[PDB]
């Protein structure tokens, strides 16, 4: 055998991690990620500044965005990045609590690995203990679907005010909770209700103050009118309150085929005939709008210089250079149909708008289109303001997370009381079953119960309360009294009851916290050989 030894290509950049020290390195590494967001859990949580390589900065406490757009090296924490992305996509809330719970399962399992238990045997006890925790919380889970729509409206407020307390929006939770609930009510079916979040749009604007944010039903467009001198506000005349809004994908342009063509003109005679040809086209395009009674016309491509003033003499406002996606969202709120060609224009395809006026912001030059509906329509649009560009973007993610909590109550009306009440209720259920079965799985069950206690101890530590006195108080009222409403109080009220504090969280959101955390750590314990190639 010679000196060179080569099997796998690039042996220098590829390193091999193995042994008991391998499990110790990856478990203690995942704790450092949760330790960063540990202080961000709960209403007392704190934000995080994120700097992009291009210079743009973002300030958010949401674990989904924090782990996103961040440079990482170790592959274990990169799984936590995809963990928070999994919690954010489907549920839209609880991304911080899952990473903290996932690291708590590894810290409790780290001491069990050194005791001589196989890592899979440790992870096998977590799957059986997670099913007993979900079955226990489901039995005590209250169903609010038995009430009417009057009490159901206030139930959505309890779920919105809880998620908005951990953001900058927490200044006034009452005023902005209506914007999240009332925007959903418009798209709800009243029976077998589905949220259909696609109909809900969110358009932020940087300026003013956050208190000026108001819920507007319609479409927000940043494109100014084609001509400056038309009136800013458009109001209907006499009856037929609808403005006969027309949406046409074809602007006003000389008709031409899409394929390459060549038009041969013979001397003067044919040259003069084509002159009158186009001059009759502008008169034909304007008569189609006047025949159907349309008023505002929008299209993808800008109008010609001759078509701009042609619509002004007839008192027909128009907007040009509107995106293709923006055209579709307008026809839904107006109950209209987009007119493909000039010959298909009819009164049945015309839209309906209560009022349309031209918005202006400060000394900057911009024009925002605001469509309003005096009656309940198919779509809603969120209008958010702020004194900083990041506060606007933070209020977007804060309002987006609030809309994700409301939609969870639409599909599943089953809700639970958070704030340390749900974690302790599911933690003591595993401890009671560990002493009955005994065996070699009693250590994997106690490690799962102590890991669930990390969430209520984190909420008490960030709020200044003693984690020792708080955890011992919760277990006393949970074991003696069957009421599970007792939980951690981060705001310091004289009562620990989560029901009197109007704190309500969806069950599908809290259920995925244990599911996503337990399934991830099971694979981490199964990772032995680690091959990392240097870049």
């Amino acid at each position: 055998m010679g000196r060179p030894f080569i099997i796998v290509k690039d042996q220098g950049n590829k390193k091999r991690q193995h042994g008991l020290e391998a499990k110790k390195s990856h478990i203690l590494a995942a704790r450092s990620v949760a330790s960063i967001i540990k202080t961000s859990l709960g209403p007392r949580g704190l934000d995080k500044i994120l700097i992009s390589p291009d210079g743009e900065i973002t300030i958010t406490n949401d674990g989904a965005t924090i782990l996103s757009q961040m440079e990482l090296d170790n592959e274990i924490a990169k799984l936590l990045v995809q963990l928070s992305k999994s919690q954010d996509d489907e549920i839209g809330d609880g991304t911080t609590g899952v990473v903290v719970l996932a690291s708590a399962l590894l810290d409790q399992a780290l001491e069990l690995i050194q005791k001589g238990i196989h890592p899979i045997k440790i992870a096998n006890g977590f799957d059986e203990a997670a099913k007993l925790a979900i079955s226990k919380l489901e039995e005590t889970c209250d169903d609010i679907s038995a009430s009417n729509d009057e009490l159901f409206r206030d139930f959505l407020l309890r779920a919105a005010k809880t998620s908005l307390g951990s953001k900058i929006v927490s200044k006034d939770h009452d005023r902005f909770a209506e914007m999240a609930v009332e925007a959903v009510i418009n798209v709800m079916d009243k029976d077998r209700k589905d949220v259909d979040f696609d109909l809900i749009k969110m358009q932020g604007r940087v300026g003013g103050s956050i208190s000026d944010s108001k819920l507007i039903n319609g479409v927000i467009l940043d494109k100014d009118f084609s001509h400056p001198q038309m009136p800013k506000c458009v109001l209907p005349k006499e009856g037929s309150d609808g403005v006969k809004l027309a949406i046409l994908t074809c602007p006003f342009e000389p008709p031409k085929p899409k394929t390459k063509h060549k038009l041969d003109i013979s001397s003067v005679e044919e040259y003069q005939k084509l002159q009158t040809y186009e001059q009759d086209k502008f008169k034909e395009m304007i008569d189609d709008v006047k025949k159907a009674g349309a008023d505002v016309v929008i299209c993808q491509w800008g109008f010609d210089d001759e078509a701009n003033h042609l619509l002004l003499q007839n008192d027909l406002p128009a907007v040009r250079w509107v995106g293709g996606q923006e055209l579709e969202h307008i026809a839904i709120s107006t109950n209209g149909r987009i007119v493909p060609r000039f010959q298909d224009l009819s009164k049945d395809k015309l839209g309906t708008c209560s009022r349309i006026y031209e918005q202006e912001f400060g000394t900057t030059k911009d024009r925002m289109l605001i469509i309003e509906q005096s009656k309940e329509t198919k779509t809603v649009t969120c209008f958010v303001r702020g004194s900083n560009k990041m506060i606007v973007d933070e209020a977007e993610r804060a309002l987006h997370d609030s809309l994700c909590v409301v939609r969870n109550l639409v599909k599943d009306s089953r809700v639970v009381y958070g704030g340390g009440a749900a974690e302790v209720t599911m933690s003591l259920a595993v401890s009671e079953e560990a002493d009955k079965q005994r065996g070699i799985d009693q250590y994997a069950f106690r490690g799962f119960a102590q890991a669930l206690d990390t969430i209520p101890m984190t909420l008490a530590e960030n709020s200044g309360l003693d984690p020792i006195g708080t955890l011992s108080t919760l277990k006393s009222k949970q074991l003696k009294e069957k009421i599970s409403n007792i939980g951690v109080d981060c705001l310091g009220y004289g009562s620990n009851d989560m029901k009197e504090l109007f704190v309500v969280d969806p069950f599908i959101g809290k259920k995925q916290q244990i599911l996503l955390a337990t399934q991830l750590c099971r694979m981490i314990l199964k990772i032995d050989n680690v091959i990392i190639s240097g870049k």
């Binding site: 096998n124 799957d127 059986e128 099971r522 694979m523 199964k526």
Partner: protein, 50 residues
């Protein structure tokens, strides 16, 4: 003279070992077993089960 459906169930649970399915094999085995029965017994394709 046993049943043909229960024959494919016991053989499928064997391959589920060493994977993440071993604990969840209760729900997951009932899927792949019903996946092969939809295909024709004469022609079995791995692109359709993608």
């Amino acid at each position: 003279k046993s049943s043909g459906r229960e024959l494919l169930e016991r053989c499928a649970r064997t391959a589920m070992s060493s994977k993440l399915i071993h604990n969840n094999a209760d729900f997951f085995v009932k899927m792949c077993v019903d996946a092969v029965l939809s295909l024709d017994r004469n022609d079995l394709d791995d692109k359709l089960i993608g």
